[PDB]
Structure formats: structure tokens, C-alpha cells
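Thread: Modeling a multi-component assembly for a lab meeting

Hi all, long-time lurker, first post. My supervisor asked me to bring a structural picture of a complex we are working on to next week's group meeting, and I have zero experience with this. I have the sequence lines for every component (227 residues in total). Could someone generate the structure of the whole assembly? Inputs are pasted exactly as I received them:
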Amino acid sequence: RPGGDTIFGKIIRKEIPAKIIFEDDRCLAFHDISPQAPTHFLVIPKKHISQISVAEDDDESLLGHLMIVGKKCAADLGLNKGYRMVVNEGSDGGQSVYHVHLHVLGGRQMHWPPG
Amino acid sequence: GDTIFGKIIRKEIPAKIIFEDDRCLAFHDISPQAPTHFLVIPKKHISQISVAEDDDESLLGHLMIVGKKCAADLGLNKGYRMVVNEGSDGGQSVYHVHLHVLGGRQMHWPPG
Ligand SMILES: Nc1nc2c(ncn2[C@@H]2O[C@H](COS(=O)(=O)NC(=O)CCc3c[nH]c4ccccc34)[C@@H](O)[C@H]2O)c2nccn12
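Re: Modeling a multi-component assembly
Sure thing. I ran the full set together rather than chain by chain. Output:
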């Protein structure tokens, strides 16, 4: 079982259903089950990294790829007034699932501060 | 940069710089929304994430790695939140790509 047994590791292996927007060899984009905006989806790596604080220097282009796929998917979903990308780390960040992920939120005016 | 962040990169106006290399700059935000609130920006003028190019991928990744290393250095051991805003709905305040890093308090949900 590559990808770990977080919920996200099981989504990667098609063991748990999700609404997938995009998939390649490096990552998977899918709609969030508790959306905080009219559009709210996640971009995750297939490589299991628990959290951004433990990402390796060599994980640089993978993290970049999450953001490139994020902005491409946002455009494909017609978020043409903009969006907010979020990564949460640890307890103060509110991280609930310990597999690195990028949130993309849009379809309404996002406020400041960002929580 | 024909933005204020351009002026910061060119060292034309003050900012409290945390880290610099050949391709990015990290500095404390002038209007902080947490006890720690800093930015990591590329030196290359990418106006917004929507127009980033495919071969900017390792650079964008570099911002996040530099951000997580600065976070650790600044003592954000209980965690943090990273944010990139795009466009008017996103609340993007400067048309030069920037990664926010906020910590030192509980960050809430939703994220704005
Ligand atoms: N599609 C789908 N999505 C799922 C499933 N399980 C979890 N998610 C999604 O993963 C995200 C984790 O982000 S995160 O920062 O780790 N977790 C958070 O929960 C951050 C937000 C948060 C919650 N309470 C807080 C309190 C303070 C600050 C932030 C928060 C959340 O937005 C979840 O809704 C699931 N199972 C089958 C299909 N599924």
C-alpha cells in the first residue's frame, strides 16, 4: 500500500471514493467533502509526505507542481474572479489529515485575515 | 517589479528581511494578521499565480521550502498556515506573487 493509510492514501489507491478533477503520475485533485466556499478542492501528492514542515529539499518541484495543477484546475473550473490557495501545518494551522495538501477555494469573496 | 514588492527587492524601501537567496526574498508583512506573519516572494516578476508558467514550477516550490525553513527558524513549532491569494475574490493585494506564512496563534476555519 504505497501512499500511506491516511484517508488521502486510500483515495489515491481508489479504495475510498472521491470526485476527482485531475490526476497525473505526481498528484491528484479532488473536491473537498466539507467545502468552505462554493468551489473547494484539494491537490495532493501521490508521494506520502506527512506535512510541509518535514518536506525534503528534493520535494521542491513536487510542491510547485501542486500549485501549477491547482491554478490550472481553478481555471478549468471557471474561477475567473480568483481564488485562495491554503496549506495547513500542525495544530495552529488546523491540520486534520497528515498527508500534505493544497486547498483551493473560490466562487465567493474570500476575507482577510485568512482565519 | 512595478510594485511595492519590486521596490522591496531592489532595496529601495525598508523591510525587515528574514532570508534572501539568488531567486527569492522573505520578509515580515507590514500589516501582520498573526504574531508571526511574513511573505516569501520570487525575485522574478510573476504578477499572479494564474499566469505562472510550467517551468516556474521548481521556483514556486522553492518559495514553500524557504517558507517552511523560515517558519522553523522563527520558532513556529506549534504550526502555521501558508496562503497564496489570486485575483479579487482571492483578495490579492499586490500583483507580484507572494506566499503568506502566518503563525503564533490558532488559525481558524474557514480561511476567510
Ligand atoms: N473529499 C474528501 N475530503 C476529505 C475527506 N476527509 C477529509 N477531507 C478534507 O480534507 C481537508 C483536510 O485539510 S486540513 O487542513 O488537514 N484539515 C482541516 O480540517 C483544516 C480545517 C480545519 C478544521 N477545523 C479547524 C479548526 C481551526 C483551524 C482550521 C480547521 C478538509 O478540508 C476535509 O474536509 C474525505 N474522505 C472521503 C472523501 N474526502
